[PDB]
Amino acid sequence: MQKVEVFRIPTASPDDISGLATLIDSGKINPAEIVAILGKTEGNGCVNDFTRGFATQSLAMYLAEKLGISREEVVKKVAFIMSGGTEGVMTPHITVFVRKDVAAPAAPGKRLAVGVAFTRDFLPEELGRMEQVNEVARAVKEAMKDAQIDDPRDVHFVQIKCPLLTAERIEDAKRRGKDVVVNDTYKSMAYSRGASALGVALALGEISADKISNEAICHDWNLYSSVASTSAGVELLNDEIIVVGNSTNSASDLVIGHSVMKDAIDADAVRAALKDAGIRSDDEMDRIVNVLAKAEAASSGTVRGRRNTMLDDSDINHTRSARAVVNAVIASVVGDPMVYVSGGAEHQGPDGGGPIAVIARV
């Protein structure tokens, strides 16, 4: 029996560890039981966002000191997934996952379970291609076993951090005689997100393997996962996976549920995800621990038939706009802008939409 506790912690800057330290110093968190930290950091969330790496370095430094181990050991032990971009009213914060073994009686209900797995590092020419899909799928299965979830229907959110391309890395690949999937560094984020998402879909049985090929990645939007949430960053060269679902072997006082936003203003889907996590009315919103969602600009350039400029705006990249919009929609339903919204939902929900999960107290 394992019990998962989840702490959503406001942050003052990317390197702010004070909220986590307060929970450790008060005895609410044993640092040795932390298994994953999922952050919203306030950089631009795109290629040249160094707040993600700054936040991970700061958390790993702090935990290494608290645990008496090296930073390298902390990064091998704990998943650090930092999603940049806190546009609009979205509030920077970290969500800390704590897992402990407990001797507790079995109960009929399934309760929150979390699992973690890491892939090998990828060469730049593997991003957005079948090697990334297949390695991610293996890691997702590994993380499910870590979460003691055997039925993929009980997986409600699979959070992934994945790499991207920079000009220097594209040049390194070229020197080795290799072509990368795309030469635009911003677009490279989409291919890494999309290949990683398809790996989730493959692992969970949402899509059969014979449908996935290099040619389909970031092209066939009818191929998608309903629970994958992927996020790209300059600060890592592999994929990190957090599987979140419900398990019969869990003693948690939390559950997770989810829905899929059909488009960026689909407040009905927010309410559906809340209801799936056991929150039946506005009066029960106080049981939210966090809301986690993917947002994107639709390839059509429209929302319910209405044109917008997200794909056209050379001044502001579209994943920034999408995060602002979907965080605002969620905030207006739950009354709190301190929720997790990540942009770029290639093969995550339909084109223009994305998965949305809610972790709630029972």
Is residue 149 part of the contact set for Cl ion (CB under 5 A)?
Answer: no
Q: Choose, by CB under 5 A, the member of 206, 239, 266, 276 that binds Cl ion.
A: 266
- Is the CA virtual torsion 299, 303, 306, 309 positive or negative? negative
109 binds, among Cl ion, a copy of itself, Ca ion, none (CB under 5 to 8 A by kind): Ca ion
- Would you say 345 is a known binding-site residue? yes
- Whether 1 and 251 have beta carbons less than 8 Å apart is answered as yes
Instruction: Find the binder of Cl ion among 319, 327, 342, 348 (CB under 5 A).
Output: 319
Select 190 or 202, whichever has its Cβ closest to a copy of itself. Answer: 190
Q: Which is nearer to a copy of itself, 228 or 331 (CB)?
A: 331
Site for Cl ion in 280-299 (CB under 5 A): 296-297
| Subset of 268-297 contacting Ca ion (CB under 5 A) | 296
> What is the CB neighbour count within 10 angstroms for residue 310?
20
Closer residue to Cl ion (CB): 52 or 129: 129
Compare residues 115 and 343 and give the one whose CB is closer to Cl ion: 343
- Coil, helix or strand for 78? coil
- Residue 333 binds Cl ion (CB under 5 A): no
Task: Write down the catalytic residue from 3, 40, 66, 161.
Answer: 161
**CA–CA dist 118, 160 (Å, integer):** 9
Q: Is 332 a catalytic residue?
A: no
Q: Does 89 bind Cl ion (CB under 5 A)?
A: no
- Binding mask 332-351 toward Ca ion (x if CB under 5 A, else -) reads -------------x--xx--
Asked whether the beta carbons of 258 and 157 are under 8 A apart, the reply is yes
* CA dist., res. 34 & res. 234, Å (int): 24
Q: What are phi and psi of 341, to 5 degrees?
A: -130, 125
Beta-carbon contacts of 14 under 8 Å, excluding residues fewer than 6 positions away, are 41, 42, 43, 51, 52, 54, 55, 58, 82, 92
Per partner kind, with CB cut-offs from 5 to 8 A, the member of a copy of itself, Ca ion, Cl ion, none near residue 210 is none
Nearest to 240 by CA among 126, 154, 343, 142: 142
Cβ proximity of 63 and 31 under 8 Å: yes
Q: Annotated catalytic, 66? A: no
Cite the active site residues: 161, 231
Which residues of this chain interact with Cl ion, rule CB under 5 A?
Answer: 131, 134, 266-268, 296-297, 319, 322
Binding residues for Mg(2+): 296, 345, 348-350, 353
